[PDB]
Each structure stands twice: as structure tokens, then as C-alpha cells.
Design an enzyme around this catalytic site. Structure first.
Site, PDB file in Angstrom:
ATOM      1  CE1 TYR A  77      40.702  35.843  34.824  1.00  0.00           C
ATOM      2  CE2 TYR A  77      42.903  35.490  36.523  1.00  0.00           C
ATOM      3  CZ  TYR A  77      41.823  35.087  35.428  1.00  0.00           C
ATOM      4  OH  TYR A  77      41.986  33.805  34.816  1.00  0.00           O
ATOM      5  CD  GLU A  86      39.186  35.038  31.320  1.00  0.00           C
ATOM      6  OE1 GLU A  86      38.940  35.077  29.998  1.00  0.00           O
ATOM      7  OE2 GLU A  86      40.043  34.577  31.818  1.00  0.00           O
ATOM      8  CE1 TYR A  88      42.009  38.879  32.878  1.00  0.00           C
ATOM      9  CE2 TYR A  88      40.204  38.701  30.931  1.00  0.00           C
ATOM     10  CZ  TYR A  88      41.361  38.181  31.798  1.00  0.00           C
ATOM     11  OH  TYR A  88      41.603  37.068  31.560  1.00  0.00           O
ATOM     12  NE  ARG A 122      39.952  34.100  25.541  1.00  0.00           N
ATOM     13  CZ  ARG A 122      40.966  33.813  24.888  1.00  0.00           C
ATOM     14  NH1 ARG A 122      41.209  34.313  23.746  1.00  0.00           N
ATOM     15  NH2 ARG A 122      42.065  33.121  25.476  1.00  0.00           N
ATOM     16  N   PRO A 126      41.407  27.938  27.464  1.00  0.00           N
ATOM     17  CG  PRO A 126      43.532  27.702  27.958  1.00  0.00           C
ATOM     18  CD  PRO A 126      42.624  28.261  26.964  1.00  0.00           C
ATOM     19  CD  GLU A 177      48.541  39.507  30.528  1.00  0.00           C
ATOM     20  OE1 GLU A 177      49.012  40.537  30.475  1.00  0.00           O
ATOM     21  OE2 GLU A 177      48.363  38.762  29.470  1.00  0.00           O
TER      22      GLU A 177
END
EC number: 3.2.1.8
Length: 190
Positions: A77, A86, A88, A122, A126, A177
Site C-alpha cells: 500500500y 493511491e 495497492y 476517488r 481522505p 486493512e
């Protein structure tokens, strides 16, 4: 030791631990590259150990136990900045495929398995820079595992072939996660 959400370096490994403020999660830093997570009827959380900054060619090793009961995943991550990305590289998951809803971009073979690659935008979510909009990339291992080595460059290159521009690398961790679930994990990174 056990810590509340935060970031730092422990035994020479960066760590990040975040949760949504719901209870039910215990995150513990251990010796060297080790960390553990124990959770029971959690909310949303993600934590683990690795590097700050990461790199675009790191070979990341991990081993240990990963035993989710419900929605969870084990991944490499990380983030980049300028542009904000971001990403993964998912090595194992529980009851839900976390790439669901993302757009498939193709496949890549790395470290003994085919991976399906995806991205999604996204929006007002956050992030490491606060509320932000950014693309989120996924590479989901078909042959799930809880120990292995990940040649991150193979994933970055596959994503780049479909339009990813990685900016400046931020953190890069092996993370556990969970999402409204229970489980345990004890992972050593190197």
C-alpha cells in the site's frame, strides 16, 4: 508496542496505522519489520510497516500469518504526490474483493501469479494530504498468499502502460486493512 493511530519509524521501518475511530482494533509494532493487528467487530482501518519514502523498483518481502474473518486485505500500500496517487498490490483478501467497482485495465504476471489491474477515481476522500481527489490503482493477485516477494516495478510498469504517471513516492508499506470485520495478522516485512 501497541499504539494508537499515527505514523513514525520503528526499528528502521516506517509505519502507518489509521482507523475511522470505531473501536475493535489493536495495532502493535514488533521487533524489526514485524507488526501485528488483532481486530473484532472493527470499523475501517489500515496499518503496517515498510518505507518512507518508498521507491519505484523496490522488491518487498513479507511473511507471517493472515487470518481475516470477513472483509480485509493484505497488500503493498502506498502513495505518490504531484500527482496524488493511491495504490495497492493486493496479495490476499477475505470475504470481499477490494477492487470491486474499479475499472479493469488489464493483467500483469509477477512473482508467481497473474494479477488483474484496475483503477478508479476517488473524489473528496481522505488522503495523505487531506480531503482530495485522486486516482486509486489496484493490482490483485489471483493466487492468494500470505508470504512472498513483490517486485513493485512490474506493477508500476503495468499501470504506466495504461496511463499512470507516478510522481514523487511517499510511503510504501505492507499493510493489513479491515472493514467491519474481525481477524488477526502478524507480518514481518523486509
Amino acid at each position: 508496542s501497541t499504539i494508537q493511530p499515527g505514523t513514525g519509524y520503528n526499528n528502521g521501518y516506517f509505519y502507518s496505522y489509521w482507523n475511522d475511530g470505531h473501536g475493535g482494533v489493536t495495532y502493535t509494532n514488533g521487533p524489526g519489520g514485524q507488526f501485528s493487528v488483532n481486530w473484532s467487530n472493527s470499523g475501517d482501518f489500515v496499518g503496517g510497516k515498510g518505507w518512507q519514502p518508498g521507491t519505484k523498483n523496490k522488491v518487498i518481502n513479507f511473511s507471517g500469518s493472515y487470518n481475516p474473518n470477513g472483509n480485509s486485505y493484505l497488500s503493498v500500500y502506498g502513495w505518490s504526490r504531484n500527482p496524488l496517487i493511491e495504490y495497492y498490490i493486493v496479495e490476499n483478501f477475505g470475504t470481499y474483493n477490494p477492487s470491486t467497482g474499479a475499472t479493469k485495465l488489464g493483467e500483469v504476471t509477477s512473482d508467481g501469479s497473474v494479477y488483474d489491474i484496475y483503477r478508479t477515481q476517488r473524489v473528496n476522500q481522505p488522503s495523505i494530504i487531506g480531503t482530495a481527489t485522486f486516482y486509486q490503482y489496484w493490482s490483485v493477485r489471483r493466487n492468494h498468499r500470505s508470504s512472498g516477494s513483490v517486485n513493485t516495478a512490474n506493477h508500476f510498469n503495468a499501470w504506466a502502460q495504461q496511463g499512470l504517471t507516478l510522481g514523487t513516492m511517499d510511503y510504501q508499506i505492507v499493510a493489513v486493512e479491515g472493514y467491519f470485520s474481525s481477524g488477526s495478522a502478524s507480518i514481518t516485512v523486509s
